[PDB]
Design a protein around this ligand. Structure first.
Ligand SMILES: Nc1ncnc2c1ncn2[C@@H]1O[C@H](COP(=O)(O)OP(=O)(O)OP(O)(O)=S)[C@@H](O)[C@H]1O
Ligand SMILES: Nc1ncnc2c1ncn2[C@@H]1O[C@H](COP(=O)(O)OP(=O)(O)OP(O)(O)=S)[C@@H](O)[C@H]1O
Lengths: 534, 325, 272, 325
């Protein structure tokens, strides 16, 4: 009785979609309360979305409406569960939660019946995954009733919605929104729309949450520094920062590596589609859509978490070196300029290096996966190509260094020019009282030519950089395809190689800047340690 | 500048940081009886269609499960005679739910499970019909529209009556139907600083309406100018006539309450007059006129105003001059 | 900023190099698309002649790229030269009362930075903007040619981007300047503490000054944080649309170019 | 210690030894319209099922008695065509009662007794349907939930305003919907002994709410601190500031009444403040703030309080010091 069990599955989705509509229509016609398992709930709901897409794929492969309707109904049921949970996060209730719990139990029952009747005789894996996900969501609901007040004894002892991010006027609410918007930044729609009309200012801007201030980051950093110095330096301050900023950085890094994996994965499903049509493809197309959106979302969340950790670190070490400025001795002009450079360039170097920290961990796995993937698509010839592109990464670095050198020289000349100007724009009446102005303008132009001369070499190096940027992509395909067929090709192979070439060219440039930033940050932290410990 | 309550009678102050404990939905039907008509009609049709589709699905399933859905001649009688597909099942659901009872498809005495589904279908249908009638009727006692028909003059003037400064404002009715026992609560708001150093952002204070021996309420047949006399005890008594037009921030609101005749509900109307809306030293034009055998009221001159040669000075200084004259 | 500033900037270069830059860029992008267009016909299977044509296109691409880069370099340097000389000459012939009226900071500052800023960043950023816009136009034209119908589906979404553009800039500029402002009194404050350090440690006013510095670093962080939040917003939304377009392109390619079109060399270019 | 009425607004005092003369049930529907929703829904389904089963039994019996129940072909026509067993009879009862009218089983013009049973079945059905709709609608005018949405600050403070001791308490609204003509009845209770040797266990006395020229009622838009001034005539005027926190037993309750707009019913809210809840010499933080073009109200500072350097002394001794200063 397969159709019978299909209908029995369709029923509970219908029940929930029908109870959701009155409440959703009343709610559709400023305190955020969060419950334990919220993030777990949303993660599991996205996994449900994915498995439901797979079930729809199965239903397309089989076709019999009644045989693939259960997926199309669970889709709206999960979306309506999301709508319910949004309506509960916005206003708490003990009853709406039970309304979810009933549906979870009934869906679990139907899935169990499906599993048994299948065991007695692709479907197997999908049904099992759905069973596991529904069970985990059930356990989450049981946790929620165990926490505060589903039925439990009389009073919830309810939390008292968090005043950190919800009390008196604050505008940057990142930690206090729905875990979907924590990814897609939906809370910025209101800000940006209001910003279009009225000019933004510090009165129109928010105030930083208690999760990120000078005091909070300074507290964590000084606690780590204390726990490290009680066990007694450059390595000490380093490990102190490391243990102080902890989980956020590694979380960003793992977001980043998973995104890198899915990005390396995209072109392979492209390849599969191209193969299938030349000789099971709609599924690959929708999977490509899903993988693209998920990969890019994870990449962006990674960027943001890293940036926020870096901003925390900048605030922390800034207020710390200001705290040190109070206890220093008078015997230690040049030190003042060194101090203000220690805040204007050294701290910015530290913070931008902390921006680029997860990229330094995620780059090697990216190039490794790239080379191993292209080898299995083009064979030995691939290896040759895989060399050429990689050879651009060290060369780039060299080029960059030359730029820096040039920059230094140019800056020198520029400074001198400014001096020869500051006089003329002060002795104005003196200058024009006898018209010696052209005589000084000749000298000013004499300086300018030297400045121009430096700029030629700088722009030549810039030109070489821009040239290599788009030359190596062409050269890779040239020396690879000519060196593969006519030396040693379905459209899929060539186009997958093209995609991988671009997906590998994009990260390669960043490794050079990462290396420069890392060495400069190491030097700047040695400097900060020498200063902070005088 | 910011206004307290708008001219139309709606409230301006936007609320922030409401610790919602859920009472906003806990008022389940006293919430939606507030709504507009399109939303309430939408949610009523959605209630009805939701219930109908739910039971149509369960009936489709029960006819499928008994096996009466499998087309076969003999050896059975369907629990519901003449049922073939989902469509006819949904037709049966709407046939029994909303109590039309077509009877082309007959539920039979062979299956007691169908008896149970019917005996719950009908009671839930009747309960949701009962609430969806009571709440729409509780709605049609929305008489705020009768709060719309009342009107006040756009700006209010002050004058000198009986040797004392006075302020005059108009009101009036717009239909034949009277409003029972209307009362006037006339209030003034101002950012005030106490002698104790306490500053309030807004300070409501009652200014009396001056009728016979006492009384808070009035009788509305024709447009009646409401007549208060500011005295040294009154809170408004201290201001100056040249500082009101531009700078000062003084909202004078009036709240007229009263129960309409036919529905019996108690409605009210609220309006504000700003420091830039009010003006000084004028007089309204007489509306009522002895016509052929009755009193004709002309609403064209309702907001009309004539100049009057009255002295212009502050009520404090005017009281000091009354002490001098 | 209007087109007049850029018009004067490029007219200081002259008619000699303007077209030499623009047409060379157009031709480089046309070669970069045509190589893949010919590879599309290369795929299905005169393989040797095909590979030789591929080699010819690959050589044309790199030669043209080198030419374009040298053009941008030479033009930028000439423009900087002429602009500096003209600025100096025009400042020389000014009346005395003009020099006395205008503060020294503004007159000196333009030469100190404007000149430096332009020389350091205008050529590279201009080259990058040109390459980006032409690559985007080329990609749109490719996914249009590959799918006759996909074109008609992509013009709606692109119009969406227009609405995403305005709302971004009118804020992204604003926040930007705010950042600059919160950076200026902070650093200066630091310096004030260093010089008059003895007076501040004598008055025992360390607490209030530490309070002021926490205030300033918070005002800096809120700005530098909203800026990265807005950049993330624009990034994610533009990316969601860039994924919608590839979804629609692949969905049209699998059916139109296989079922009825019966062409396989198309879907490759469009998807890639 | 024992509280008079609880914070939630429910009454604490438990009644003992009520000479029930039966009026508790004599209010038959004004009793059950008070009940919760599950109980009222239970008793409504039990009313309906009771009536249906009663008439299904009587119909089963009448078809049995006529002999039409005995399956036979010819020499008869059943009073109700196509009736076989009890199940089909109960199906006929629910078919005619709740007015679906399936018509598979036809009541015929051969037996007038069936006509009588139908003509009483339908009228009793209609009457019990009429009451079971009117009472559920009379229920959906439960607006006590709107008595739930009102809020008062947890504790009340006293201050010195205009050179005289004052007590300040907050109130406020939680929805867009206004409450018409709300009035304040502010009462104090205390175990009192008269000079005649009479001791009362509890003694309610009115303490005035101090508005303009008079008036018992207020206007609620934004949170308005209610402002009374205790004077030598007031009953609370005698206490001491150090004896209130721990020992004395003084409950100060406030009862705010008002009719909600949309339903028109008159609701109220009641709250108590104990001697240990109230505190001395403080000031609330200003809630209302001039935002962009409006007034923003922040309910986070609703219960917030700041210290104020005010003299601490008894109102009697403070009045004696005012006589001295
Ligand atoms: N314990 C009680 N509980 C509730 N109601 C009561 C109670 N006692 C009396 N009543 C009613 O309320 C009124 C109070 O009057 P009472 O104290 O009973 O004096 P009474 O003269 O004895 O009147 P009775 O008891 O009816 S003969 C009476 O009229 C009773 O009807
Ligand atoms: N921000 C708010 N919005 C709406 N209602 C509130 C808010 N804060 C409190 N309430 C309710 O109204 C009353 C005001 O008392 P409060 O200012 O909260 O003092 P409280 O002692 O902290 O009481 P709590 O918050 O319930 S422990 C409380 O009893 C709350 O139930």
């Amino acid at each position: 009785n397969g159709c019978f069990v299909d209908a029995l599955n369709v029923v509970p989705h219908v029940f929930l979609l029908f109870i959701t509509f009155p409440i959703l229509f009343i709610g559709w016609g400023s305190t955020w309360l969060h419950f334990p398992g919220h993030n777990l709930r949303w993660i599991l709901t996205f996994i449900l979305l994915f498995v439901l897409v797979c079930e729809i794929a199965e239903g397309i492969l089989s076709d019999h409406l009644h045989l693939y309707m259960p997926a199309g109904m669970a889709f709206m049921a999960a979306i309506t569960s999301v709508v319910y949970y949004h309506n509960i996060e916005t206003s708490n209730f003990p009853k709406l939660l039970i309304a979810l719990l009933i549906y979870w139990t009934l869906a679990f029952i139907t899935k169990t019946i499906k599993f048994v009747k299948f065991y007695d005789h692709l479907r197997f894996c999908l049904t099992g995954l759905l069973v596991i996900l529904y069970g985990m969501l059930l356990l989450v609901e049981v946790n929620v009733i165990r926490v505060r007040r589903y039925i439990f004894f009389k009073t919830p002892r309810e939390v008292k919605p968090p005043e950190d991010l919800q009390d008196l006027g604050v505008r940057f609410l990142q930690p206090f929104v729905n875990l979907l918007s924590k990814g897609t930044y939906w809370w910025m729609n209101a800000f940006i729309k209001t910003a279009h009309k009225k000019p933004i200012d510090l009165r129109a801007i928010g105030k930083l949450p208690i999760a990120m201030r000078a005091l909070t980051n300074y507290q964590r950093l000084c606690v780590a520094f204390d726990a490290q110095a009680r066990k007694d330096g450059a390595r000490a301050i380093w490990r102190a920062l490391c243990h102080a900023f902890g989980r956020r950085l590694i979380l960003s890094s793992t977001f980043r590596i998973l995104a890198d994996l899915l990005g390396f994965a995209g072109p392979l499903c492209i390849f599969g589609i191209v193969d299938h049509l030349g000789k099971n493809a709609y599924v690959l197309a929708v999977l490509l859509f899903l993988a693209l959106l998920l990969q890019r979302t994870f990449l962006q969340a990674s960027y943001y978490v890293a940036i926020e950790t870096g901003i925390n670190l900048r605030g922390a070490i800034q207020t710390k070196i200001y705290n040190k400025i109070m206890h220093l001795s008078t015997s230690n002009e040049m030190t003042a300029g060194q101090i203000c450079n220690l805040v204007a360039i050294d701290t910015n170097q530290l913070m931008w290096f902390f921006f680029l920290c997860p990229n330094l961990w995620a780059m090697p796995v990216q190039i490794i996966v790239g080379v191993i993937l292209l080898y299995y698509i083009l064979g030995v010839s691939a290896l040759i190509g895989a060399a050429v592109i990689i050879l651009l990464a060290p060369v780039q670095y060299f080029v960059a260094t030359k730029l820096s050198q040039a920059q230094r020289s140019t800056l020198e000349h520029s400074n001198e020019r400014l001096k020869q100007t500051n006089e003329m724009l002060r002795g104005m009446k003196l200058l024009k009282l006898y018209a010696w102005e052209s005589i000084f303008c000749s000298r000013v132009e004499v300086t300018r030519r030297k400045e121009m001369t430096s700029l030629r070499a700088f722009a030549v190096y810039t030109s070489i950089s821009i040239f290599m940027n788009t030359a190596i992509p062409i050269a890779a395909v040239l020396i690879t395809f000519v060196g593969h067929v006519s030396f040693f090709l379905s459209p899929s192979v060539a186009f997958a190689s093209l995609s991988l070439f671009h997906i590998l060219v994009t990260p390669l440039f960043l490794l050079s800047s990462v290396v420069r930033s890392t060495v400069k940050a190491l030097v700047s932290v040695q400097k900060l340690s020498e200063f902070l410990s005088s | 500048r910011a206004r307290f309550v708008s001219k139309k009678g709606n409230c301006n102050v936007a609320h922030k940081n409401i610790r919602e404990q859920g009472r906003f939905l806990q008022d389940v039907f006293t919430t939606l009886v507030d709504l507009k008509w399109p939303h309430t009609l939408l949610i009523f049709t959605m209630s009805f269609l939701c219930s109908w589709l739910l039971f149509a699905m369960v009936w489709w399933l029960i006819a499928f499960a008994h096996g009466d859905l499998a087309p076969g001649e003999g050896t059975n009688v369907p629990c519901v005679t003449s049922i073939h597909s989902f469509s006819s099942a949904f037709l049966f659901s709407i046939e029994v739910q909303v109590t039309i009872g077509f009877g082309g498809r007959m539920v039979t005495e062979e299956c007691p499970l169908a008896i149970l589904i019917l005996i719950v279908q009908n009671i839930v249908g009747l309960m949701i019909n009962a609430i969806m009638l009571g709440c729409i009727f509780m709605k049609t006692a929305q008489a705020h529209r009768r709060a719309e028909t009342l009107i006040f003059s756009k700006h209010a003037v002050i004058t000198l009556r009986h040797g004392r400064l006075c302020f005059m404002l108009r009101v009036g009715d717009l239909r034949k139907s009277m409003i029972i026992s209307a009362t006037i609560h006339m209030q003034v708001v101002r950012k005030t600083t106490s002698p104790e150093g306490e500053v309030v952002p807004l300070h409501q204070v009652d200014i009396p309406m001056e009728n016979g021996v006492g009384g808070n309420g009035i009788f509305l047949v024709a447009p009646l100018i409401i007549y208060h006399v500011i005295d040294s005890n009154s809170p408004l008594y201290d201001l100056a006539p040249s500082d009101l037009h531009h700078h000062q921030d003084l909202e004078i609101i009036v709240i007229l309450e009263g129960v309409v005749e036919t529905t019996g509900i108690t409605t009210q109307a609220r309006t504000s007059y700003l420091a830039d809306e009010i003006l000084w030293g004028q007089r309204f034009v007489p509306i009522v006129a002895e016509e052929d055998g009755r009193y004709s009221v002309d609403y064209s001159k309702f907001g009309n105003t004539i100049k009057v040669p009255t002295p212009l000075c502050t009520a404090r200084q005017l009281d000091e001059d009354r002490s001098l004259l | 900023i209007p087109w007049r500033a850029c018009t004067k900037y490029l007219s200081s270069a002259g008619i000699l190099l303007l077209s030499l830059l623009v047409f060379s860029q157009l031709l480089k992008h046309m070669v970069l698309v045509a190589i893949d267009y010919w590879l599309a016909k290369w795929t299905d299977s005169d393989q040797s002649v095909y590979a030789m044509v591929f080699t010819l296109l690959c050589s044309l691409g790199i030669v043209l790229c080198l030419v374009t880069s040298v053009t941008v370099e030479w033009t930028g340097l000439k423009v900087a030269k002429r602009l500096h000389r003209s600025l100096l000459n025009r400042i020389i012939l000014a009346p005395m009362r003009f020099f006395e009226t205008t503060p020294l900071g503004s007159i000196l500052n333009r030469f100190s930075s404007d000149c430096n800023t332009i020389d350091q960043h205008i050529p590279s950023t201009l080259e990058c903007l040109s390459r980006s816009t032409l690559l985007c136009v080329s990609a749109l034209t490719v996914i249009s040619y590959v799918t006759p119908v996909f074109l008609v589906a992509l013009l709606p979404l692109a119009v969406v981007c227009y609405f995403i553009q305005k709302y971004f800039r009118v804020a992204s500029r604003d926040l930007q300047q705010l950042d600059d402002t919160t950076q200026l009194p902070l650093l200066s404050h630091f310096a004030e503490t260093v010089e008059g350090l003895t007076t501040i440690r004598a008055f025992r006013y360390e607490a209030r000054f530490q309070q002021k510095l926490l205030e300033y670093t918070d005002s800096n962080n809120i700005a530098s944080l909203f800026l990265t939040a807005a950049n993330r917003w624009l990034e994610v939304r533009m990316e969601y649309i860039g994924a919608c377009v590839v979804l629609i392109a692949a969905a049209t390619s699998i059916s139109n170019s296989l079922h009825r079109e019966l062409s396989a060399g198309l879907v490759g270019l469009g998807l890639t």
